[PDB]
Ligand binder design. Structure first.
Ligand code: CLA
Ligand code: CLA
Ligand code: CLA
Ligand code: CLA
Ligand code: CLA
Ligand SMILES: CC(C)=CCC/C(C)=C/CC/C(C)=C/CC/C(C)=C/CC/C(C)=C/CC/C(C)=C/CC/C(C)=C/CC/C(C)=C/CC/C(C)=C/CC1=CC(=O)C(C)=C(C)C1=O
Ligand SMILES: CCCCCCCCCCCCCCCCCC(=O)OC[C@H](CO[C@@H]1O[C@H](CO)[C@H](O)[C@H](O)[C@H]1O)OC(=O)CCCCCCCCCCCCCCCCC
Ligand SMILES: CCCCCCCCCCCCCCCC(=O)OC[C@H](COP(=O)(O)OC[C@@H](O)CO)OC(=O)CCCCCCCCCCCCCCC
Ligand SMILES: CCCCCCCCCCCCCCCC(=O)OC[C@H](COP(=O)(O)OC[C@@H](O)CO)OC(=O)CCCCCCCCCCCCCCC
Ligand SMILES: CC1=C(/C=C/C(C)=C/C=C/C(C)=C/C=C/C=C(C)/C=C/C=C(C)/C=C/C2=C(C)CCCC2(C)C)C(C)(C)CCC1
Ligand SMILES: CC1=C(/C=C/C(C)=C/C=C/C(C)=C/C=C/C=C(C)/C=C/C=C(C)/C=C/C2=C(C)CCCC2(C)C)C(C)(C)CCC1
Ligand SMILES: [Fe+2]
Lengths: 48, 74, 50, 34, 288, 32, 31, 337, 27, 306, 38, 28, 71, 27
């Protein structure tokens, strides 16, 4: 532990970080799909 | 079809008055005759702890679960 | 416990009742309890707040 | 800390007395239009 | 005037600048790839690939390079541990520099396309107003995607022309790149069989080409055209985001639960391997 | 090839097709 | 006579009354 | 170009079905109804049947039903045992093999309710879109409703998928949800997570905005088209008391929408973070300072100790598959500190 | 903790300055 | 009318001030200023407090090695209890701080300030001519604050039970409270949760409907709501709708505050333990029993002393 | 060179927007820095 | 030194509040 | 605004592709093929989903890490 | 060196912010 002054608490491998980030972006992009589809279907009323 | 006319109709009153008690007694018998326990698998208050098993059940099997529950049950 | 809890709740509710009824009575006495006159709003007679 | 006690007491009493007399100054509500 | 959150909506009906912005985003992506790869090499310590694999050093982008055959570094060190043969042109530094060069070229292309936006190509021959044939542009782009998929599945992974892909033993002791023979039976569908991937791409290519041809030769129906409103470009964005988040969910699942595309050699063990006593059972059986 | 799980899956598949066909036929019949 | 409103109200009501009839005696069960 | 903009053309069966579906009846069936009314209906029935008759004696080793003598609060639909892992538990699947009784006993009814309810939520949002389209109005209600779907997906689907199996998903029931809440408090220290903070802030602010807007509108009416309430009077009042007050009605009624949606979305992101055990559990600096100096002690340390106690005293019965037996000397206690 | 300090400082400088530039341009 | 009293009264009562002062402001402003000043100074720098009164100080000041999420103003020490503890009754300033006086000072001044603020909310409303009872809607958070900070310590007999003025302190208070009393399994806390969730729901839905309807109409939104769910023709006018919006959350928070005060006198929530018993006398566990085990863990780890 | 772009627009945001933005950045900072430092 | 950072963030936030109160933009 | 854009050899080479925007076939066209292939793709997705979930067990499929050694 | 860091940070923040507030008021 002396080399990098390890704090003694486990960290997450690259697999966990990849999964976390990509799932969060998946939810956000579901919201984006919903919003942009809503605009597309309702173009006339949205325009004015 | 406004609700007032259907409410005041005699045919409605008679058919519902004959059918509703039938369903109520159907549920009453469905519970009191023990058919509910057999169909839904809920144990009666006097077989929760079979003589071979004095502790709570536990499955420990994904694919081969049928006879496992057979053993745990009864 | 029953006495204390019940009477605290009742006292608090009656205090809220005081607030409501006192406010309503003062407003009615002033004369604008029914609502704003929509012609002579007291706010309009004041300069813009900057 | 007697000095601090008296200072706090006098400031509080000043505030409370002003608080009371402010309302005693206000004239009763009335309805001109009636 | 526009709000802060609509500033990019100007390019909606200006394809010339749309091309430039998409090129610029691609340039940012490639530049991130290259810069991350360079910094990624700058910190890696290949001294002990036994008890200090890459996945224990926060090695995020390097495993993706390693998965497709690139194992040699210009510094002499190799992932396997030995010094191996000459690195050749294709190395980690090579890919990083290549991505940086590509990003810069795309930057220049983006600037060019930004300055020159009014092109007769985007203008409808019948009417002066700019129009885009989305049902056909989709056909051409699907055709290109199918061609690329077939090429990857038949030449790179198969080892006919390329190096292949990474494969390892079930318990992650010894693993390295080889060619993959496509498997066409039901056994090629299970996640943990590399032979599926190759085969998949081949099929996934060929069908695409046919679809790429079909949409290129058949125009949409009127009912579909007005129900889906394919005239507007916003529908394309909505559908694309839908497919994108579907892909994100699928990729996240394949990563978390483990598959032949994420060997534990270069990504780390899965939690379900510890929960079910995978390596414990292996060690106990071997010792017994 | 003829494993029981496949049989159950095909049975469920035909059941779903039956439900879809029933709904479609009901809609068509009631509409006109 | 067979309107969708009729279908909805009956599909909701019939299980409801059946379940209430069950639950009453269910409560009367000796423990 | 070939034809006119889909005015009449031909009266295909699709047009007749569409006309019948979109009739102005008492209940708007719509196209979404074909997906909403069936699924959602089962999503209700499966719960109530689930709450009434079936038991949880084999999955969790508990009695959760009216038939077994449980109150409304106590009754619940329990998740399948941890052995089932992530099986969807089809009634025709290998686990049940078409035996309805054992399918109920194995706990598959929870999967039934969850799946059919998710599809019912999708159908309901599509219904919102359909009605908004039919009345020529902007579909902001669908955008608002996207948040509860996000929370439901993040809590009932993403989370158990991230864990060992369905066993750790919330069980439908008033007391079961309390167990789940205390479970997150004990293990994941969910209160400390920033995303939960950013969600609770949104929720409480939403309640605050609702109350304030109702009181303000109801207390600035005009005596008796034109707006009933005096916007200028309310703006002056709230700008002189609080300091800042709304000036544009549209912005206010959009803020009332923006707050809860953002709060719940952020909480959903937090729960996604927890699904992979990425939990904002500890402060390393404070832990090391407390370790080297026994005297040092803050509220955070007491919370950590309480979490240790919760885990130790709950794991015995909340996770039967582990077969955990704790000797009485091992369970944490305050006096032993 | 140098990484935390630099990340915090960047998050306070870049976005707030970004907003200020636009507002200055507007007026 | 140049008398000092006259001009001072005109200044205080005048609406020309940027922030209306009013007579209630006379007590409102200085009290809140004192509370916030002492709170800021104590949070920034203050010595450890002996919350439990057995000579085991608890660090809570930002400067003494703890974070924002963890920093808090420790409540008054258990030794003093309900006795009035200003500076001048303390033996010395250092002892005053060690025992935890500033929390008592802050809470007293804060309660006075919030009550005076509730009053001014009526007074200004009377000035402008608008209807008076906006203060009634404000009585909910005030009631909850009074229950948390004053009534519960009075019931438990000590001031150490008041909510610590910090985030992690708030979490500790909530967990300990759940341990001692089943706050979760109490109908009034259930009504409070219902009130909060319903307030969020109604705010979101009303915002969506109104912002969608504002195009260039309320009939269209009414029809939209009526057709969406089976329910038809309710809240036909803005008056009833905007009254209901205020009525739901206010009643919910009134009930949760009353539940907290009720528990202050040891009247806990429902206790469904060993509710289900099989034949010949065994115990079948239910979800309430797992909740009970969690409560056992919390309570046993809470009792720091033997 | 191409003709001047027809659909050129300029972004605006008033003082309320600036205050909202600054308050958001600072609130997020005070919330998250406690965990960044760790 | 983290204390100074926390205090800077807090006082900065209070400054934003103060400016939002007293220096409001007159609408339109 | 009436003047066309810059003339380039590449543009005129690719001009024919983006030439008939808006052209559309009459009737429903090939929507029946859409229905058929949507259903077939849904069936395929269900097949692979139940293969990965293990809810569908096949004799050839092993569906585990131990299959890496196999072939 | 904490005194140096805080002094530098104050010198950057207070005067530049001071100027920015004035300029925002002017426009
Ligand atoms: C999804 C993409 C992704 C993934 C999975 C990873 C994963 C990883 N990266 Mg990489 N990285 C990425 C994108 C990604 N990175 C990008 C785009 C950049 C360019 C900026 C970097 C730059 C980078 C560097 C320079 C380093 C890493 C490192 C790491 C490793 C350590 C954990 C970590 O990221 O820090 C932990 C991550 C967090 C604590 C962030 C949590 C996410 C929250 C939600 C952010 C919220 C921000 C909030 C709203 C506002 C902040 C307020 C402010 C006051 C702070 C891990 C393998 C380190 C390493 O050892 O690998 C070499 C390292 O030194 N990454
Ligand atoms: C393929 C992806 C894609 C594309 C091309 C677009 C494109 C567009 N969107 Mg959509 N959107 C997307 C995804 C996408 N969006 C997703 C995933 C969401 C959900 C979060 C949204 C939600 C959304 C809303 C709610 C709105 C738009 C709008 C718009 C238009 C204006 C852009 C804007 O907001 O101003 C430019 C925005 C900024 C300059 C602000 C950027 C600051 C961000 C938030 C922080 C910085 C992030 C960081 C630097 C990069 C993160 C990278 C990450 C993805 C890995 C534009 C046509 C607007 C519109 O069309 O209305 C007419 C609109 O109102 N979008
Ligand atoms: C002896 C005391 C007293 C008297 C004589 C009155 C008399 C009056 N009040 Mg007042 N009021 C009181 C106490 C009193 N109130 C208290 C304590 C409160 C606080 C809640 C209120 C709050 C209040 C409001 C908010 C309003 C009135 C109104 C009225 C007038 C109409 C009566 C009414 O609402 O119809 C009779 C109404 C009902 C019978 C409905 C009953 C609904 C309640 C919720 C039933 C609850 C019963 C339940 C079992 C009790 C559980 C208690 C538990 C918590 C311990 C009338 C002049 C109204 C008015 O227009 O004034 C001019 C009006 O708007 N009052
Ligand atoms: C539209 C309404 C609807 C929807 C969306 C669902 C959806 C679902 N149900 Mg529910 N269900 C419904 C109506 C619905 N059901 C009705 C009306 C009943 C009463 C009869 C049930 C009774 C029921 C039970 C008892 C169970 C489900 C289950 C399920 C799930 C698994 C279904 C599955 O994989 O089967 C297979 C799915 C399909 C076949 C769907 C269509 C797939 C495509 C179209 C096949 C195309 C191939 C080919 C062209 C067609 C064959 C041609 C052939 C004739 C030659 C899923 C969430 C199960 C579950 O998961 O519970 C936990 C379960 O146990 N449902
Ligand atoms: C109007 C503003 C106001 C109010 C209401 C209070 C009220 C209080 N302060 Mg604060 N304080 C204030 C301004 C105020 N202070 C200011 C401006 C300063 C800065 C100098 C301070 C500095 C300060 C300190 C340093 C301390 C207090 C303390 C106290 C408490 C005890 C004081 C006492 O015994 O008074 C008794 C007053 C009277 C007996 C006079 C009563 C006047 C009439 C007759 C009363 C009529 C109504 C009544 C119900 C009967 C009390 C809650 C002390 C404490 O322990 O707080 C918990 C304490 O340590 N205050
Ligand atoms: C040393 C010191 C200082 C110690 C301090 C220690 C410490 C603990 C500091 C606090 C730390 C801190 C800041 C923590 C909170 C951080 C936190 C969790 C932030 C969440 C931030 C975040 C991004 C979450 C997203 C969720 C989100 C959108 C929440 C928004 C919440 C919010 C702003 C709600 C509204 C609140 C509110 C008061 C509204 C009132 C509006 C109002 C004046 C309306 C009046 C009104 C009504 C009418 O009807 C009409 C008609 C008009 C006209 C009118 O005007
Ligand atoms: C917003 C979106 C709204 C639309 C969606 C609405 C819900 C749709 C209906 C629910 C779908 C349920 C999917 C079931 C998936 C499943 O059963 O997995 C079960 C299997 C995993 O199977 C597991 O494998 C493990 C590894 O060996 C272990 O062996 C386990 O024992 C075994 O059960 O996974 C899949 O087949 C699906 C993978 C692809 C989809 C992933 C979804 C997101 C994953 C998130 C990861 C954590 C974050
Ligand atoms: C057409 C449907 C007819 C009604 C089916 C029965 C419904 C009532 C269930 C009561 C419990 C009965 C217990 C046996 C349960 C049972 O039926 O098992 C029957 C069978 C398994 O039984 P075995 O193969 O063990 O039995 C062998 C023989 O004895 C015949 O059973 O499973 C199937 O083949 C599919 C059954 C699907 C039944 C559910 C229908 C819904 C499917 C999902 C549809 C989704 C459509 C979505 C569209 C988008
Ligand atoms: C005597 C009482 C003294 C009270 C002092 C407290 C004052 C609080 C003032 C909050 C202003 C927030 C910034 C508004 C920025 C601003 O300019 O908003 C302006 C906005 C009004 O906008 P308009 O209606 O002019 O917008 C018109 C649209 O067309 C957009 O242009 O005000 C609101 O809508 C209500 C906002 C309440 C938001 C409350 C948030 C409270 C956050 C508190 C954080 C404390 C942190 C503490 C750290 C230790
Ligand atoms: C923070 C973060 C994030 C994001 C991030 C990002 C998004 C990033 C990006 C990044 C990037 C995007 C980067 C980039 C970079 C780039 C570069 C670095 C480039 C370079 C280039 C060059 C160098 C060039 C050169 C050249 C040219 C130009 C060509 C010609 C030749 C030469 C070679 C000269 C989020 C929010 C998610 C959260 C988490 C974390
Ligand atoms: C599972 C199943 C299914 C289905 C199912 C269903 C569909 C169901 C339904 C169900 C239902 C549909 C139910 C209902 C129920 C109801 C109830 C159970 C009710 C109750 C009520 C009450 C209890 C009340 C009370 C009260 C009132 C309100 C009045 C007075 C007061 C009081 C409080 C007393 C399927 C086919 C898939 C398969 C087979 C099996
Ligand atoms: Fe409203």
């Amino acid at each position: 532990r002396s080399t990098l002054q390890s704090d003694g608490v486990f960290r997450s491998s690259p697999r966990g970080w990849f999964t976390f980030g990509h799932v969060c972006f998946a939810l956000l992009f579901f919201f984006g799909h919903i919003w942009h589809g809503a605009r597309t279907i309702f173009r006339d009323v949205f325009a004015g | 079809r406004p609700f007032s006319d259907i409410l005041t109709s005699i045919r409605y009153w008679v058919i519902h008055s004959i059918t509703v008690p039938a369903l109520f007694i159907a549920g009453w018998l469905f519970v009191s005759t023990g058919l509910a326990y057999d169909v839904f698998g809920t144990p009666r208050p006097n077989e929760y702890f079979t003589e071979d098993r004095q502790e709570a059940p536990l499955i420990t099997d994904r694919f081969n679960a049928l006879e496992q529950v057979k053993k745990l049950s009864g | 416990s029953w006495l204390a809890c019940s009477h605290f709740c009742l006292g608090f509710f009656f205090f809220i009742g005081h607030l409501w009824h006192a406010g309503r009575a003062r407003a009615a006495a002033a004369g604008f309890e029914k609502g704003i006159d929509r012609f002579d709003e007291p706010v309009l007679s004041m300069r813009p707040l900057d | 800390m007697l000095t601090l006690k008296i200072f706090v007491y006098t400031v509080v009493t000043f505030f409370v007395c002003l608080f009371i007399f402010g309302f005693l100054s206000n004239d009763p509500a009335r309805n001109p239009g009636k | 005037g526009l709000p802060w959150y609509r500033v990019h909506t100007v390019v909606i009906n200006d394809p010339g600048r749309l091309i430039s912005v998409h090129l610029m985003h691609t340039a940012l992506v490639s530049g991130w790839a290259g810069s991350m790869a360079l910094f990624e090499i700058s910190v890696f310590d290949p001294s002990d690939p036994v008890l200090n694999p890459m996945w224990r050093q926060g090695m995020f982008v390097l495993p993706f390079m390693t998965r497709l055959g690139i194992t040699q570094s210009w510094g002499g060190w190799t992932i396997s541990g030995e010094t191996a043969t000459n690195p050749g042109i294709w190395s980690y530094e090579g890919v990083a520099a290549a991505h940086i060069i590509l990003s810069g070229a795309l930057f220049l292309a983006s600037v060019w396309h930004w300055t020159y936006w009014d092109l007769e190509l985007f203008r409808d021959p019948r009417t002066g107003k700019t129009a885009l044939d989305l049902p056909k542009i989709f056909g051409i782009h699907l055709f290109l995607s199918g061609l690329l998929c077939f090429g990857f599945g038949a030449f790179h992974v198969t080892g006919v022309f390329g190096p292949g892909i990474w494969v390892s033993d079930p318990y992650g002791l010894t693993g390295r790149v080889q060619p993959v023979a496509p498997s066409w039976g039901a056994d090629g569908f299970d996640p943990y069989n590399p032979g599926g991937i190759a085969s998949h791409h081949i099929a996934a290519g060929i069908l695409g080409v046919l679809a790429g041809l079909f949409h290129l030769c058949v125009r949409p129906s009127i009912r579909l055209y007005f129900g889906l409103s394919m005239g507007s470009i916003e529908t394309v964005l909505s559908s694309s985001i839908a497919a994108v988040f579907w892909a994100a969910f699928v990729v996240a699942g394949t990563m978390w639960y483990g598959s032949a595309a994420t060997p534990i050699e270069l990504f780390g063990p899965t939690r379900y391997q510890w929960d079910q006593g995978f390596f414990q059972q292996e060690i106990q059986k071997r010792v017994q | 090839a003829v494993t029981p799980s496949l049989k159950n899956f095909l049975g469920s598949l035909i059941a779903g097709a039956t439900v879809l066909g029933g709904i479609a036929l009901a809609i068509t019949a009631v509409s006109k | 006579i067979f309107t969708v409103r009729w279908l909805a109200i009956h599909g909701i009501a019939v299980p409801t009354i059946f379940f209430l009839g069950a639950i009453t005696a269910m409560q009367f069960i000796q423990r | 170009t070939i034809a006119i903009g889909t005015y009449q053309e031909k009266r295909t069966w699709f047009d007749d079905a569409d006309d019948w579906l979109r009739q102005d009846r008492f209940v708007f069936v719509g196209w979404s109804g074909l997906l909403l009314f069936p699924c959602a209906y089962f999503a209700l029935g499966g719960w109530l049947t689930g709450t009434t008759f079936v038991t949880s004696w084999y999955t969790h080793g508990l009695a959760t039903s009216y038939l077994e003598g449980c109150n409304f609060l106590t009754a619940a639909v329990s998740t399948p045992a941890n052995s089932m892992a992530h099986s969807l538990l089809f009634v025709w699947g290998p686990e049940a093999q078409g035996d309805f009784t054992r399918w109920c006993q194995l706990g598959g009814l929870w999967a039934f309710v969850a799946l059919h309810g998710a599809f019912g939520l999708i159908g309901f949002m599509l219904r919102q879109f359909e009605i908004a389209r039919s009345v020529n109005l902007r579909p902001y209600n669908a955008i608002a409703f996207s948040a509860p779907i996000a929370v439901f997906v993040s809590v009932f689907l993403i989370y158990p998928l991230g864990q060992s199996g369905w066993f750790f998903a919330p069980s439908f029931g008033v007391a079961a949800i309390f167990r789940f809440i205390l479970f997150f408090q004990g293990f994941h220290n969910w209160t400390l997570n920033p995303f939960h903070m950013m969600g609770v802030a949104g929720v409480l602010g939403a309640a605050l905005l609702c109350a304030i807007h109702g009181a303000t509108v109801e207390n600035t009416l005009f005596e008796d088209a034109e707006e009933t309430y005096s916007m200028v009077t309310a703006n002056r009042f709230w700008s002189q008391i609080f300091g800042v007050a709304f000036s544009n009605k549209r912005w206010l009624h959009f803020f009332m929408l923006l707050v809860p949606v953002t709060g719940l979305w952020m909480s959903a992101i937090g729960v996604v973070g927890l699904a992979l055990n990425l939990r904002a559990y500890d402060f390393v600096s404070q832990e090391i300072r407390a370790a080297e100096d026994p005297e040092f002690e803050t509220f955070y340390t007491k919370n950590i100790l309480l979490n240790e106690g919760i885990r130790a005293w709950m794991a015995a019965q909340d996770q039967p598959h582990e077969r955990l037996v704790f000797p009485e000397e091992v369970l944490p206690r305050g006096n032993a500190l | 903790n140098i990484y935390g300090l630099t990340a915090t400082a960047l998050f306070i400088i870049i976005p707030t300055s970004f907003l200020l530039i636009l507002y200055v341009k507007t007026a | 009318n140049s008398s000092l009293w006259a001009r001072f009264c005109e200044w205080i009562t005048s609406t020309e001030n940027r922030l209306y002062i009013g007579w209630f402001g006379v007590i409102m402003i200085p009290c809140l200023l004192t509370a916030t000043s002492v709170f800021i100074i104590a949070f920034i720098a203050a010595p450890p407090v002996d919350i439990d009164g057995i000579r085991e100080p608890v660090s809570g000041s930002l400067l003494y090695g703890n974070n924002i999420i963890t920093g808090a103003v420790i409540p008054t020490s258990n030794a003093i209890g309900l006795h009035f503890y200003p500076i001048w009754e303390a033996a010395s300033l250092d002892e005053w701080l060690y025992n935890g006086g500033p929390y008592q000072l802050i809470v007293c001044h804060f309660l006075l300030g919030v009550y005076c603020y509730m009053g001014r909310e009526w007074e200004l409303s009377f000035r402008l001519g608008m209807r008076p009872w906006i203060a009634v809607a404000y009585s909910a958070p005030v009631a909850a604050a009074s229950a948390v900070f004053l009534v519960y310590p009075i019931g438990q007999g000590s001031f150490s039970d008041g909510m610590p003025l910090g985030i992690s302190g708030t979490f500790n208070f909530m967990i300990v409270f759940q341990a001692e009393h089943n706050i979760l399994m109490h109908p009034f806390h259930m009504l409070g949760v219902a009130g909060v969730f319903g307030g969020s729901l109604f705010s979101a839905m009303h915002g969506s409907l109104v912002t969608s309807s504002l195009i260039r109409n309320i009939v269209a939104a009414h029809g939209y709501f009526g057709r969406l769910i089976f329910q038809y023709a309710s809240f036909n006018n803005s008056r009833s709708l905007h009254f209901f919006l205020a009525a739901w959350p206010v009643i919910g928070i009134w009930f949760t505050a009353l539940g907290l005060s009720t528990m202050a006198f040891n009247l806990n929530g429902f206790n469904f333990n060993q509710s289900v018993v099989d034949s010949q006398g065994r115990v079948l566990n239910t979800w309430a029993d797992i909740i009970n085990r969690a409560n056992l863990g919390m309570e046993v780890m809470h009792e720091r002393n033997a | 060179m191409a003709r001047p772009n027809p659909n050129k627009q300029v972004v605006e945001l008033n003082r309320t927007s600036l205050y909202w933005g600054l308050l958001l950045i600072f609130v997020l900072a005070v919330l998250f820095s406690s965990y960044i430092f760790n | 030194m983290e204390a100074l950072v926390y205090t800077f963030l807090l006082v900065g936030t209070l400054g934003i509040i103060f400016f939002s109160i007293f220096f409001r933009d007159p609408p339109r | 605004f009436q003047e066309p854009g810059l003339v380039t050899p590449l543009g005129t080479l690719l001009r024919p592709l983006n030439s008939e925007a808006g052209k559309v076939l009459p009737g429903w066209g090939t929507t029946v093929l859409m229905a058929v292939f949507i259903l077939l793709f849904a069936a395929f997705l269900l097949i692979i989903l139940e293969i990965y979930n293990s809810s569908l067990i096949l004799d050839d499929v092993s569906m585990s890490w131990e299959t890496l050694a196999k072939v």
